[PDB]
Design a protein around this ligand. Structure first.
Ligand SMILES: *[C@@H]1O[C@H](CO[C@@H]2O[C@@H](C)[C@@H](O)[C@@H](O)[C@@H]2O)[C@@H](O[C@@H]2O[C@H](CO)[C@@H](O)[C@H](O)[C@H]2NC(C)=O)[C@H](O)[C@H]1NC(C)=O
Length: 218
């Protein structure tokens, strides 16, 4: 997240950090006790058994007894196309079920086919780079964004921060876009580099996949 702010500790208890070699590299969302939802490009070419799924985190730079750490046991995709970044969504089956407490909870999702209009106020978040060569974020970041259709495909939900250069950046892939309490997006791609002020950020449109998601998780 470039141009955002620290989230309050555990303000988004569904927020998930995907990790390799002990380092964060993608976000995800908890959609059931034993399932997380991320971008398909995040796990396309990784050792799935080497990934660790970290729930309940806030400062990746510390030790937090609030964390619950899981492995991945099975992958579910839905026609992902890496050339054009279509259907950029995956479901991760965990090696167990999380404990729902203050700092770990299941997110709410929209109805199948729901499509957001221009100007809807949303919130992006993640542990990705802060921009300006400040490096990767330590504490979870959040950013106020607006839904836009200009320079966006109908196969995405895109967002933009009007008037300044801010947006998602490297490491935010897979993170949720929250609009009115529901998860409508999964971070998929930027254009013109991060925080360009020229192109909106593009999210996989969760609403288009809710029937498929249910069929995985009940
Ligand atoms: C679910 O997975 C977690 C993650 O640990 C990794 O994946 C496991 C399959 C196993 O290979 C671990 O050793 C891997 O590091 C498991 O958490 C680990 O559990 C062991 C034994 O209790 C413990 O010594 C490690 O410190 C734990 N690692 C972390 C990062 O917490 C967990 O036990 C698995 N649960 C089930 C039911 O399989």
């Amino acid at each position: 997240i470039v141009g955002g702010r620290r989230a309050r500790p555990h303000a988004w208890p569904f927020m998930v950090s995907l990790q390799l070699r002990g380092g964060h590299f993608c976000g995800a969302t908890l959609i059931a006790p034993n399932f997380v939802m991320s971008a398909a490009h995040c796990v396309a070419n990784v050792n799935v058994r080497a990934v660790r799924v970290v729930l309940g985190a806030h400062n990746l730079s510390r030790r937090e007894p609030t964390r619950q750490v899981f492995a991945v046991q099975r992958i579910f995709e839905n026609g992902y196309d890496p050339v054009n970044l279509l259907n950029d969504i995956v479901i991760l089956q965990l090696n167990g079920s999380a404990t729902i407490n203050a700092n770990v909870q299941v997110a709410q999702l929209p109805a199948q086919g729901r499509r957001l209009g221009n100007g809807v106020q949303c919130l992006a978040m993640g542990w990705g780079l802060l921009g300006r060569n400040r490096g990767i974020a330590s504490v979870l970041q959040e950013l106020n964004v607006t839904v836009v259709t200009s320079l966006c495909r109908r196969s995405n939900v895109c967002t933009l921060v009007r008037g300044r250069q801010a947006g998602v950046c490297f490491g935010d892939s897979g993170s949720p876009l929250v609009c009115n309490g529901l998860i409508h997006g999964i971070a998929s791609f930027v254009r013109g580099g991060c925080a360009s002020g020229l192109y909106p950020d593009a999210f996989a449109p969760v609403a288009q996949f809710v029937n498929w998601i249910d069929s995985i998780i009940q």
